[PDB]
Specification:
homodimer; alpha+beta; Thrombin, subunit H; main proteinase (3clpro) structure, domain 3; seven-stranded antiparallel sheet; binds 2-(3-cyanophenyl)-N-(isoquinolin-4-yl)acetamide; binds chloride ion
């Protein structure tokens, strides 16, 4: 029993974290094989970030301008290239701790673990979701740029995020491992604002199933709803629309608990229009939306890595 | 900016997780140097669950009764001993991935990371606090026994917990790495109940300082309180009494935010009286008590 926000074990990723320095800027890099990936803004000064021409700044750099440190060993940069908002530093040494890995771009609503790093050293691991507005509500300080988001599929690490910046509201923006930003953000010190965030509906439903598996069943009701009536209500409360794909993905949890997806949707519809009434679900007074249906199955069934 | 429940990176601990089998029972073990630590209840059959005599059961076992597996390699048990509720299996191979480590016993209110494992394989990592009733509110399934609780100080893993059992309320009980249970619990199927849980007051205060550091100020007020008046109010909401030690420990956060501890204590009194009124503090509608003052300083600085 019990339900916790749970990150993937971070060991396979910790063995890839290195420190990358360019001039006065020091951030984190991900060392996989003989390439170190890091945000391209590591080559920027204070003036540069205001309006940077990254192609021009990178051409002016040499391999000896980049200092890469893996533990107490300095790696020598033998090449440098840029792929979108990510800098790729070719090193002379393949990372002997390179796990089986893949670069994946995630969709909003999907969850992943973040290994927050400072000076190439892992300091914490937490689980978050890519918000529907493409930001992540992370916990990052100065020096955390380059920290990565990942999932673990069997024995394969799927890198899905790299940290680039903090928006004025304290939320975070970053790219996939190919340097493509999640969301309408740019890597420049300029006024940027995330769109109004919405609740990840399929994740709330999955979390309601997790509560039922754990015996917390007060919110269950006799009612069911059509997917259209549910979406009309949910949209008014800034909840993401639930698609037939989401209903299908919630199928195994529906069969395990005996509560059809549209039956749980009528529980959610009531919770939205009326609140919790002083009650809690899994010790929470708010509906939790950072557990996907897969996360709930994995945690309530004990899948290992 | 931002505030998250954050676990320590689990790599140094993952390289220590092994699978321990004794008869039909399979659980996890912690492989450090040439010793594998695991719950001694791994040696129990169905008949030895209500009233096991562990000294008698262990004497009847031989090294070949224990099967230890580290990845795909079977380790050979060359010795076995018991220290309180933990079983120590001497192996003929020192763990090459043994980190710098230490065994620490923690106090209620202290936080740590749990690396939940099944069959010697790490499946997830989460953050916990030792509850004032000495239980932990973990997330564990059958087979999680031997999963460990830890903190990391620079390059050193301080092991503070080993999972042994689930109580009838779904909360968890375990021991330090010397086999001493936290709380009045025993490794027996006999009727056991945790005492009524209470809120870790010093941790709520630390979390209110974390919110202020992150720009939340709505719960602040112009009142201050005596420590005695605060404890009289807090006790009525099942909150732990705040001692002078707790006030002193909150000193650095008090100096960083410019809000004295007893000033923050009056904010906490008001939140307990009014509730949140549809507002949240750091995205939460309830007062969070699983962040110590040390955690808040670590994460914010
Ligand atoms: N010392 C001890 C001890 C005494 C009685 C029984 C046990 C076994 C025990 O409590 N296992 C479990 C742990 N953690 C989670 C569990 C979820 C479901 C079912 C069992 C779970 C251990
Ligand atoms: Cl599924």
């Amino acid at each position: 029993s019990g339900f916790r926000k749970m990150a993937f074990p971070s060991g396979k990723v910790e063995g890839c974290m290195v420190q990358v320095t360019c001039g006065t800027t020091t951030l984190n890099g991900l060392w996989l094989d003989d390439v170190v990936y890091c945000p391209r803004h590591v080559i920027c000064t204070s003036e540069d970030m205001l309006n940077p021409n990254y192609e021009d700044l990178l051409i002016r750099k040499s391999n000896h301008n980049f200092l890469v440190q893996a533990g107490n060993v300095q790696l020598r940069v033998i090449g440098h290239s840029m792929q979108n908002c990510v800098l790729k530093l070719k090193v002379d040494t393949a990372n002997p701790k390179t796990p089986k890995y893949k670069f994946v771009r995630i969709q909003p609503g999907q969850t992943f673990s973040v290994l927050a790093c400072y000076n190439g050293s892992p300091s914490g691991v937490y689980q978050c979701a890519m918000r529907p507005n493409f930001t992540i509500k992370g916990s990052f300080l100065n020096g955390s740029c380059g920290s990565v988001g990942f999932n673990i599929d069997y024995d394969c690490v799927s890198f899905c995020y790299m940290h680039h910046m903090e928006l004025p509201t304290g939320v975070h923006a970053g790219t996939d491992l190919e340097g493509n930003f999640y969301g309408p953000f740019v890597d420049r010190q300029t006024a940027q604002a995330a769109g109004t965030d919405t609740t990840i509906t399929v994740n709330v439903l999955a979390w309601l199933y997790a509560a039922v598996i754990n015996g917390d069943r007060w919110f269950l009701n006799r009612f069911t709803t059509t997917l259209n009536d549910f979406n009309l209500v949910a949209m008014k409360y800034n909840y993401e629309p639930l698609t037939q794909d989401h209903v299908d993905i919630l199928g195994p949890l529906s069969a395990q608990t005996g509560i059809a997806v549209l039956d749980m949707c009528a529980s959610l519809k009531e919770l939205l229009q009326n609140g919790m009434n002083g009650r809690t679900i899994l010790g929470s007074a708010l509906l939790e939306d950072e557990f996907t249906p897969f996360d709930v199955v994995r945690q309530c069934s004990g899948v290992t890595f």
